[model samples]
Target chain A: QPLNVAVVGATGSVGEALVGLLDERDFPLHRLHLLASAESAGQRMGFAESSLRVGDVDSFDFSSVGLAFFAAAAEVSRAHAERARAAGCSVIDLSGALEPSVAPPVMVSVNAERLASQAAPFLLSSPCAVAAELCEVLAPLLATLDCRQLNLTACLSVSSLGREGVKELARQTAELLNARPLEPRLFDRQIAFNLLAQVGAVDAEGHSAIERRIFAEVQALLGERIGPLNVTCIQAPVFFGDSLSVTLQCAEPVDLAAVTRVLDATKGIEWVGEGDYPTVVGDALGQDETYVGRVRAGQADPCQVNLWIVSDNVRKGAALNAVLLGELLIKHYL
Target chain B: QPLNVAVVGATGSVGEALVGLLDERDFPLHRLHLLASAESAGQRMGFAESSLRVGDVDSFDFSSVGLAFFAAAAEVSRAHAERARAAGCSVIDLSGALEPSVAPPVMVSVNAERLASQAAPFLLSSPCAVAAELCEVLAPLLATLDCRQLNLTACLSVSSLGREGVKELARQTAELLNARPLEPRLFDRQIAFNLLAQVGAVDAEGHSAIERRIFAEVQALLGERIGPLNVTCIQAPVFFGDSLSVTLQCAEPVDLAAVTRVLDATKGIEWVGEGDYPTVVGDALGQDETYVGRVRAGQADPCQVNLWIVSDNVRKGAALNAVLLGELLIKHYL
Candidate 1:
């Protein structure tokens, strides 16, 4: 049976990527509804190699739609998720509104099978791109290895801040290139040629709200399978891609070759072996899998191995993961 | 009493910063000779808030200069360091020529006393900016805490590549802003708005030359004091400042509050406490001290702690640290 799907926040970053992927991946859908806010309503959008006038999200009927993906802001998701859920449409949230109390939260690859088998009415995907990417890399490694602790330093681009973030970075970069002083609009300070340590609004403890959310979600997603995870999210000056440096401490000795062999055999990963360079940001942009490379043994501890990971935050970290999860549901239950 | 000193590679990035600090920090010197390559010879440069004409390093007499600092390339140091040392001047190598042989290696602020009091005729400083900054942060923590292992992810700016790297980033950024493709000059790839996983040329084992040098230097400098140190250096898009995310695993339990107290008490380290955010690259630019913040206990391991460290790679990490070591030599022996 052909499914009916609605993409909320149709003009957003991940929404556009999803549309592009939907065309490329060729999802089996009979009806595709592109819905946005009042301002973006009536605007013509070319999606999946076809054009469609964006529908108003506020007044869009969910009774006919089989599934609705809430990709707008937290407020939009909070306002419309329940209405769609009550109307018998399975609601999927892709916005940054993930709470521990929400309906079945899934980190795509890690629990794709389990989440697909669940009979949940509503589902929540990652709003934190770094956490999503981290889970994918750690899940398989933690399953086989006796890893006890993880330290992740995520260097995220402006895409994590959404569409406006990309625009602001371009504007500031151009302004700086022209030798004009940058006026930070979205960011509190100049982020063109500099780095911002804090990503979201930080609490009194120095940890940002986004930091707390990402850390909590990773644990909630991984559970007792993985050890405690610590994350430091830095706002890099780049415009796309998410890069991570992961330090995994295991309970037993980890042969460097054995670790690489395990990582290479895993899904959605690539290993940079001897005579090859590791993956960088440029290499990760527009990529589907979570590109990982630069694996090496710890200087002092053979039990510890360091690695680098990168991916297009909007694609694999957000839209693709969300779409893939939806596809799994479609193949299994719908 | 005032003494004579020679500043080699006087036109370089770290050299300039050293010149500025030598004046601002008021190093007691009877005579200061500024030496550069043949191409930069006869060019008038400012020194000690005043000015001095650059001298040719090929024939500059080192007999009068008590101590000569090499901030030039490995080849330059290999060529001239011995010549200067042969002339009875205490030589210091700041380039990438560190070996486990002849000259005693000393990371300032860590083993300043032991190395300064030694009878070694020559000394070797940190080969990379990240290694220098790491030593300063770890010295105090290791003195009090029994750290068994360390994992460091250094997000280094292009300034770590020196003047040419900064110029290339600016040029590439402008070309990209004007819709022109970047022509990679010094860097082997596109550095503008991108992150390079490998900092220097990679070896057969997939580790870059700089990565290998940094890891080896850590063990050489710190001895058996700390656990094995693992480094994953990523070249960031920024033009200045070096940022690091360090995860320290200890042999015993770590007190979070006590860690803060110890860091605050350490000289040349500024702890970013509650209500105040951690230091970013921009904040560290032109600054002397290493700015530290975002310190928290590990979620899984109470014996672990994570921290963010930032410093002006040219100033604190390179020039200032080198100049401070020279000042220590002046007080202790000269």
Candidate 2:
């Protein structure tokens, strides 16, 4: 069952990865529209063997495609996702702009059955990359443990901001290395050799928008099983991938070997073995699997479990999860 | 009550900071000996009024000093601290080398009263830089909250490994920026724009030495009051200061304003107020005060409190803490 699909924000980092994945994964397609803002529309992007000229999202008719992926900024999705839905196209929003009530935050692996009950044109949401990746890893593990509390510190890469973020880090690193005064542009301060405590502006409660999203989405996905969650997101100097420091406080003693076995057998997780660990630069870059390692029981409590999780934020975290949702829709919901 | 003192690892990053702080803080010093490994001997380091020659720790006679600060490698401290103690010199070890039974971990602000009970040649252990800083901040807050679980993710700067760690990051960053092939030195992997999931080699149980030290020391200091503790330490690319993401799970609802008041009013803490936060490069690098911000309650659970803490690893975390202990010793314990 082939379908016409449109990829909005096609030239951006996650969008570009999504485009590559759409071809690489052989996503069912009769016609593909590479759509971006008017400013980015004049360029060309490779697809399969040939090249496709980027089209303006403003002018591209959404009715031509059965599915449209809004991968632009949240504001862009807020402005145009409903427009696409009204044009008889099912929209999977990667930006997480639309209210959850309108576009249900969906991770196909976590809640594929929930999609069957939703009405069309389906307005689905692919959660924040970190949230999506965490859910995929934790859902199974949470099912195994009588988890009492979850504490997670997400160290995000600069590329979480997009291509401009990637460029800013490169420019900043070069400028700093050459001993030039760094004029921090994209970030509020130097992002080259520093860690920013917060990723974006915080609400009155002191939680950043991303932190709030991660907390809400993770709760929504696994709240029924897991207990209270504490989430903090910090901006790291890394250009890509996310490094998660997670502690799960369980009701009873956590068997370290048993937990390792769970992670090892779980699909989509590459469990780096004992005495070895996974790093974003070494293991997770350009990889689809979430690398899990440093699995150990707490120094004090046998009930507490600690894990170091790393994933390619752009590919596995964002693009692949979104594409997986698109496939879920075509195979089941559509 | 001026006393002669010696600083081991006097030429290293933490050691250098300790020497400068001893002069800056106007310690009641009768004489100061800058001691390092035999290889680093013969160099001169700046003191208050003049420079002091770095003497070899192996050859330096400990009987001349009333106090000795071991800021060198654990092996150096382990080999010589007992010898210093036998020479009637009080030892304050920053190396976390001595057995806690021998050199009980002490944070001046948290457990100064506990120091008087110990017998001399007061073999005191200044906890891991991160642990010392945390105990200083949490001791007061734990007094207020009915805390149940404490989870901390310590993102340690390369400087945590001392001057070599600092140089490795600089070298790695410069090489990569120039598009040259990166050969990771000091660190097992590239520390330049990357986050290594773990700091050093893990034990058979998978806990790094630093992590184990932090857990044990923190537990020793605040375990009676606080509940279970979960700790993870990761190596960050930053050259100085540690950025800690901490979550305190309390037994009851946390009063956000009340917690803020406790932190703001606490000594040794610079509480960056609501709406503003602190970063290592912009705020904490050269400063002695621990810059703490992003105080918030859990997204759903009011009992959970989260904090972002940044402090200079060399200056405040290790050196100044040891100096403060020396002050404590001279004031009362001595």
Candidate 3:
């Protein structure tokens, strides 16, 4: 039987994208409940042939729903995820709360099979989009070589923060172009044609928690062979798609041709080699496979390689990955 | 007697800056000879209070000149530098040809004595402005803490490439904005509003020669106590004021307040703290002082420090450093 689904925080960006994907893929849904905060309650959301009224998530009972997709903030998710799971609903969480303590089996396309062994009626975590796409593209090559260290600087888009972040970026950019004083509320610094090296709050260690998360998440997906990952997450002014310039150092010789061939054979990835590659805008509004380019052998090591990875954070990073998790749960549990 | 000064490669970006600096600084000159390749011979260039008729460098008599500034291509400098030096003229070659073979000592404001130790009249060197300024700013801090590794990314100005390179960047940017085809000629790739991982040709080791130069130059200037350094160079699309986001790992404990005080005490460097800092346009038109801002301690290492360094490449990186060399020659050699 098709699962009855409840999408909490359904009025947000991730929720809207999930609804669209369900409609486009024609996922069998016995009933779809659109749940949101009280402010968004009573709004009608269209999903396929049916129109569902948004109910307050705080007041909704999850026992009737077979699967619960929590797209809300971490605070809300942490407060309510256990409640939904206790109510016998399998939960797919797209929140930072799933890592470390929960061991939520962070899913990357390269290691999606890891999700199969995860505990039932529990949260399934999605890795950062750039980290997920990069791991997928690098896994095969890393397996052949002694993967050691990774130094990554990410050029992230506003959508990483969701819809309001996108609006803020656009607004700031427009203000900059108009010569008006830039009012930066969403970001700590100016977000108009400028790049900020600091992303998220600096922890006691000085690196942002997001940076630590990416480092830990990539290791989890790639396994113990890849050690000492150093990451600097930079927020760019672009509205969509996250690009990571990665330098990988390995213990064995890496053949560029073989690496390129492996990347080419990889599924859900499009190899954009050398000069002709995709930019953030190219993949922003499109549903193409994750783009990888600028592949070159590393200068410091014989076994190292450097490349650029670009992906739509909203789709592959969050929502699409959540839906994929749902499919994995059904395939394994049922 | 006025020095018979010849400005080789008189029409390039650094060449133009050299000419302007010579005129502005009132370098003692008997006769100014503007020299280029056979193609550019006979072109007229304006210097302070005089017009220089361009001459073919192939036929120009280097013996007649007292000081010859070779702002020519690396190959051209490598090919002709011996001939110029043999002609008995002191050569301050800026093509970076002497960087590897000759331990050309750099003179930051703190260690201006290095400029006087040259045994050979022919001194071949010029540090990139960002490096020059950064070294000066870092000089005082080095006394308090031992800096080991440095990671830097530079935002280079179009002016770094010369007039034609600037024109090409502007043209490409305009075309990109207008949604027209970009026919990039000067740059190896399209550089308008785009960032490139490789600034120049990657060496056999996979690092750009420019990146290698920075590490070598910094080591030579600061000595081995500064220790082994790893650097990655990228070319960002900005016109003027090379900015470097630098992360330095220190060997000793670092106090943020003390580091700030040390940086503030450094000469020829302005502390652009919280607000009121040098920007791209501001630095392009400005002179002399290196702008240091965005200072903080790194997360991974409490001993590590992170700061942004900005300077006018033409002025501090090239011409001013050369002029300082000249000043050293006058004080010590004369």
Candidate 4:
């Protein structure tokens, strides 16, 4: 059952990574179509050994492909996702535009069993970068420990905003180092060597969209097995990867050795132990595994566990997981 | 009566700021002597329209001054603090070297009332930078909110490590920008564009000394008025300022408007509201007041309150607070 696939927003960061992964992993592709906005059409992208031309997404015919990966903005997905699904093309949306009811959030490692209940012409969503990486780390630990509450401080890199973010950070750093006055763009203030407390605007309840999405997606993925979660999303000056500080309050005293053993045994995770810890630049940049370190019990409560997780937000957090989900769907249902 | 004071570690960052602040704030000083290590001695520092040559701390007599501010390393404070107190000079230690019983951590706004209970030749410790800023913000809120648990993610700048930390960041950034390889010093890894998950070596319980100090000092200052605190300290790439993400789980639903009103009414706090927030570079770097924003209730549980705070770790966090304590001592007890 060879299948044709379309990569939407093909010129974007995650989309480029997705195309590269498909080629690197030898995804079962009969034909690969690269779709972007009208202005970006006709650009050349490498696929395997051949170069493919990007086509306008608005003019793309969805019925020609059996699977479509939506990596564009939420507005683009909101306009085209349903039409693609109606055309009998199973959609894997990464923009989080579609409601969870419409597209069930799926992280293969955490909830692959849910795939059995879905009918054909599937509509599924890959969780956000942070949520996906966090769920992957927690899945193994949750199997043995009873978690009561979860608190996270997510420090996202500039690349989380895509290409413009990367460019802005570089430009700002160069200007500042040369003693030039900076006129900050893409971000409200200096993103060059400083931390931005909030990622985006907050609603009446003072929760940013990213914060709300993380909480909801994690709850949906973990179900009633986990308790109430508090999330704070910050913007770091790094170019790539996410740095997460996590604290889990469990029902009983956590066995530190047992927790370490489970994380070490788990695949797709690199557990750094002893006195050494992990950072994005040294351990997780361009890496597939989520780097976990500084694993220990709380200073006050032995039942509480603390962890530091660093993962490439664009790699394992987004493109890799989506590609893996694609493999699962193709092997069984597509 | 006017007092003669000795500023230890006069060549360090915090010590320089302390000396300048003493002059700027018009403290009643009969005489001021600057002291540092033998190698840094003989250097002149500006104070009140005069330059004072730094004296070697080992050779200086503690009995010459009525007060001493120890901004040097913990070892220096450990060696000279008791000697200074024995010689009838009050010692205000910025380093967390002495135990709480010996120095009794005090912040003027939060626990200035404790001043009256101390015996003559007062010995007090100013809390760590992050702890000091947090206590100042939480003092007003705790008057109304009954907090059950406190969770903090402290993103500290390289400046927290003193002058060497700042130089290292500058060197790393310049080397990286020039497309040259970085040889990291002062810090274990690259501190140019990455976040270090752990600040320093952790104890057997996996708590770093700074984290443990924050927890203990907050407990001592607030003293049963608050609950168990969980703190995570991360080293960021910035040159100055401390950024904190805080969440307080309370006994009842938090009144968001009431929280805002109290923060605004409190002195030494700048409450950013109505969708605008503060950042370290533009708002808090050299400012005296702590900039607090993103005040809101939890998305799922209204009983949980969250906030983001940015403060100058050197100015108000350490130097000014110690100077204020000195004023209180001279005005009454000393």
Candidate 5:
């Protein structure tokens, strides 16, 4: 029998993409369920030939479902993921809120083996868009070189914040272009044709919580604690694609050719050439591969490497990664 | 006698701005010599009380001028700067070739003291627009806390590349908006309504030469061999104002209150509030100071801080900084 799956927060951006991917990939589904919050309950979402009615997750029975994907906010996922797990549904969380001890295994295309290790009540976690792109590009290099420190400045898109963020961008851009004074509402500041350096709330330590999470997730996916990883997330005036400018110091001799080769062979990644390299809109929208380009050797030392990586945060960074995790769990169990 | 200043590369974006600034400030000028390349030679440029005929810098006699600001390409400036200097004239070079070194000390409002040390027949350099804004914001913090590292992603305007770049952006934007095929000319790829990560040529060490130079210039100006400073330069869709998302790591605890106080008092800089910040058009037309806002404490370490800095690259980043250097030279030597 095919797998019975339920998608939580079906009305969200990631959730909508998840439904499309499942339909496009022709994932074998005995039954598909769409769930949303109270405000969105009773709304209808089309999965395939049949239209799935949006149901409230708080009262839904998950025992019959083989797997459940949580694409909601951290608070909502935290409350519902445990219930799905207790009811014997393998929970694949797209939210970045899994507990440290129970944080789902993160699996980038380069590190698919990590997904195979999840056994009981399989809960898989998806890294942020920037983190997802960095891991794919850095995984091959990390095996050969010992990275002492990692610094990243991320140019994130409105889509990373989901559908509302995308709408906010469109709304603001239209207003600004039409010479109407922008009523900045969605973001902390006017993000139309502007850039904001700080993302998420600043903690007491002077770093953003999102920055801390990315570092922790990268270390976890790498299977060992690497050196210091500092990240600054900046919201750019783009609708899609999350790009990261990364700098790192390695302990061994750096081989540019070898690094390039590894990245070229990696799945779900496209290498941008001298002039035809990756762009946020060009690579991020309607694409699943992580685009890596502008690779350079660091000026500080021979062991350091610098590069830019971009990917669709909604797809490879979140929904697609979760689906991959679900496939891994299904293959491993049942 | 007042200095006879020749604004080389007149009729260009930066050149036009320099002319306006000179008029606004009423700089003591014996004669305003407008110079350009062979193609634009003989064009009339209006100044207060008189109109100056554009002269070809390639063959012009610099013997009569006391100061010449070469606002053209590196090759043009390098070729003519020596001629002016040999004629006992001070030449201020506004090209990357003279930055970081060879050129006299850059004078961001905070580092105004360095201007005192420059001697005669010298050329002055200005840091990149993004670097200029960042330096202003970080200057106060550097006094109390030792900044170890800085990572920046710059959203540069089309004006950075001059008139052609701006026209291309406008043309392509109109085409794209009308659903027509984009024909990019100046840039290798479609730059209208897009963001590109790489700025200049990638060095053997993997970083852009411009990025490396900016980092070095910041360190040299601060008089400290700071930690790894990583930068990514992106060609943004804006018409002016090179905005930067900066992350700084300091050795000592950063007092936000003290930093704010220093920033508020700094010359040639204005602080943008939560929503009342400057954008591309605002920076393009406004003649005020560089804007800094969205200050946030770090989450990972107490010694780190994140903020957004914006400044008009042509005005403050290059032309104005060069003009300030000239003013300083006159005060110190004459």
Candidate 6:
């Protein structure tokens, strides 16, 4: 059944994807309202069948809407999520910065149990795309095996940088291809042909928000920080898709074929065999499943296993994750 | 005490770098012959103070040279390396494929001790660039702390594919920038903005030759297969530098600061603090040292350490590694 929907920050990347994906996934929508921020303009944004006008978030009342998606910039979402809930509308925050203190961050696929009860004002979909891919893979592994901790090195693309990030990559790449100078914007280095370890500015504890957000969300979704998650996020030159190098240490022994079965058995993951090994590029670019490959035992540690994961950042990481939570809300909660 | 030298495959990427680097390091070269494969052309290669015409290597006699470097194609090196060694010119094979049966593959930085005692025919320079950086960092840890096994997710540049690899990346990138189609000449996919886990073709055992080359070289350089060295080699989009995500399982407990101190104390390696993290383009390209950063303790295991090592692939990975051996040969054996 189609539910009444209000997509805030409708002009942004995730908002653009969310509005369409909801239709693509066949979430029967009664009405889809495209609300843009007061600072943002360009009305009549195009959708699948028709177009919707962009309304100002400050002026719009959400009392009529059944659910609202905070796909706007974090600051805008932080300012409005509470008011939307106060106005009797549930919120699915795509923004990672939206006060996790209100309610713990939850990845819908792994731990959406809290949502089955009372509607939580903040059902935070993971802001760091790594969280979606990590949770999708790790949840089953963690549940099946007696696990210790998880380590992931995410080779994320510039699209995670959002609107300006996408445009900047194109700009810098064009400049480089034609042999011109680039003033490093968004990214402080020449990102067109380079790699940067600093994904976001580091905090006092020496962790970027990108790393902290994913680790924090995964731990929170698991309902405990059982085993610590150490993450290193790097900004690659690519324009889209988040690629990861993940390692999980188990308390029990590991079998390569057995683990392959586990991953294939699990949902939202495509097992890439060694024969079709590389498993990159378009493999996960427009696909729904988080593509994994090069599965093998630890060179020396039998209990440890390594996985390579890649997913489209905007599709799976932000918009798609938020839509999945909305689906759970419609099916079970609302 | 200048040595008479001949560098086979002198027209390729590593060959060009070795020629220029020799003069930059001011190695005493009494006479240097620039020999190219029959197929490769373009004469009068320029260097620091002078230029040399490219000579055909097929008909060249190695007997007149005191030392010769096999930087040519693996097949060419395979056909000529033994004859060159038999002709009395000590060979530093940069070609990793040379029948390890005829001579052992040893890294000069790790197992250079044997070079001082007796002249080995081929002081095998790490044919794989991943081996150069991996060995430079691991040699210290293995020597100081009791390390059981090592794992490396080498984010290597396309230059490892050699001369054509460089040209192919340039061609594809230019096509991508101009919105033209790429035929995927050297690489099977569009490497301009993507990563490929299969560096080479898949074998029956499921190991790509790229992966086999690294672990095999690591073992050979370490002088023994003490512990299994597991490797996953990915072909990165970058044209030059190689970046690595390395994890080491120590036999004893580990202190990250102590490990950092070990890397800093070692030569040919620059310790990159998180704030001063090593990036790929400027920090590594044209640089002599392997820059190591993004270091931290394993979340659950104090005995495990994670490190990000970046270096110029053509520099340290091939040419410089071979030149270092050439320097040792002149100092000790010659």
In terms of lDDT, the best-performing candidate is: 4
lDDT of 4 by residue, B123-174 (tens): 8898888999999999999989999888999999989999899999999999
Which ranges of candidate 4 are over 4 A from the true structure?
Answer: none
DockQ of 5: 0.38
State chain A's TM-score for model 6.
Answer: 0.93
DockQ of each: 0.57, 0.83, 0.19, 0.80, 0.38, 0.44
Task: Itemize residue pairs with steric clashes in candidate 5.
Answer: A205-B298, A205-B301, A206-B297, A206-B298, A206-B299, A207-B298, A207-B299, A296-B206, A297-B205, A297-B206
Better of 3 and 4 by lDDT: 4
Residue ranges of candidate 6 with Cα displaced over 4 Å: A1-3, A98-101, A117-124, A142-146, A222-228, A251-253, A265-267, A277-280, A298-304, B99-101, B116-123, B141-149, B223-228, B249-256, B298-304
In model 5, the fraction of reference contacts reproduced equals: 0.34
Please report, in order, the local distance difference test score of every candidate based on alpha carbons.
0.78, 0.87, 0.70, 0.90, 0.73, 0.76
TM-scores of the models, in the given order? 0.93, 0.97, 0.78, 0.99, 0.89, 0.91
Candidate number achieving the greatest TM-score relative to the actual structure: 4
> What DockQ would candidate 6 receive versus the native complex?
0.44
What digit string (tens of lDDT, one per residue) describes model 5 on residues A28-135?
778898888898889888877777789988878999898898888888788888878888888878777784557645674656776556667777677766666788
Regarding TM-score, does 2 or 4 come out ahead? 4
Model 6 Cα lDDT, one tens digit per residue, A1-334: 3467899988888788888798789876788787887777557877768777888888888877878888888887778887888877788877866646674566676877866555544445454578878778777766666666566778888888887887898898888777788777776678877777668777644567777777667767765524657677878778888888877777777767887898888778888885775344667776688888777666556787778888887877778888888887777664
In the range A53-105, model 2's lDDT, one tens digit per residue, is 99988888888999988888888898899999999899999988884678878
Query: What CAPRI grade goes to candidate 3?
Result: incorrect
Candidate 2 reference-contact recovery: 0.84
lDDT of 5 by residue, B1-334 (tens): 6688888888777887788778877788887888899999978877886787888887777888898887777788777777778898888777656656677447646577776666777666666566666676777667676777666777787777788887887787667665798877886677765778777566645566567767767766655635666677777776777877776777876787667676778777676544344554545335657777656555445576666777888887777877777777777667
Alpha-carbon interface RMSD for all candidates, in angstroms: 2.4, 0.9, 4.8, 1.0, 3.7, 2.7
RMSD of every prediction: 2.5, 1.5, 4.9, 1.1, 3.4, 3.0
Residue A140 in model 2: lDDT: 75
Pairs clashing in candidate 1?
A: A300-B228
